[PDB]
Design a protein around this ligand. Structure first.
Ligand SMILES: NC[C@H]1O[C@H](O[C@H]2[C@H](O)[C@@H](O[C@H]3O[C@H](CO)[C@@H](O)[C@H](N)[C@H]3O)[C@H](N)C[C@@H]2N)[C@H](O)[C@@H](O)[C@@H]1O
Length: 176
């Protein structure tokens, strides 16, 4: 009887939603940055680019309402160097995500989405670990990920250019 967080593959029609969310300064403060001036063209170019061999773009849904976005990609090849993550034979996925409808913030939805997608990547992709790299100043997001079982592994100084500053991030990892 409990409402469920789910996700589904992003399709071309969802680019309308993405334009709405990523021209909303409330969202851009936490994802992409308020200095980014998105258009239909930039959204298409950036959100259909296949910059990894294995990438899934998904719409996060709560009670069938589309409320956010995630990108999930297998770390392979040069992608390991982007996290100074030592390559082994383990299968590693990284993820970025945002909730674009702010009325669904601070409801535990972020942590619950993390739990659902980790169980999916484990059971359907045999993922060994899932990694995240939130900004250190986003303690809300760090706390939410830790509640979903992501362990803090190490700090990533000057990791992410965000609104004109190189921000320190936190490497976080889920295994079980
Ligand atoms: N989490 C919030 C942030 O998430 C993304 O940033 C992520 C990059 O996408 C990843 O990089 C991959 O995508 C790049 C193109 O974007 C490629 O150049 C690169 N080779 C790819 O490995 C990088 N590893 C982690 C970083 N968190 C958004 O971009 C950023 O706006 C948003 O605020």
């Amino acid at each position: 009887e409990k409402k469920r967080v789910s996700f589904r593959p992003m399709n071309e029609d969802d680019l309308v939603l993405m334009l709405k969310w990523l021209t909303d300064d409330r969202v851009l403060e936490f994802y992409d940055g308020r200095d980014k001036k998105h258009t239909q063209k930039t959204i298409r170019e950036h959100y259909t680019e296949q910059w990894a061999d294995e990438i899934y773009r998904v719409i996060i849904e709560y009670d069938t309402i589309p409320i956010g976005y995630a990108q999930i990609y297998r770390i392979q090849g040069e992608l390991f160097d982007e996290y100074n993550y030592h390559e082994t034979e383990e299968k590693i996925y990284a993820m970025d995500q945002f909730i674009g409808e702010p009325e669904y913030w601070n409801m535990g939805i972020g942590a619950e989405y993390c739990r659902v997608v980790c169980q999916y990547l484990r059971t359907e992709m045999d993922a060994d670990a899932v990694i995240l790299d939130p900004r250190k100043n986003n303690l809300r997001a760090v706390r939410a990920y830790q509640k979903a079982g992501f362990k803090i592994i190490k700090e990533l100084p000057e990791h992410e250019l965000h609104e004109g500053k190189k921000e320190d991030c936190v490497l976080m990892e889920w295994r079980v």
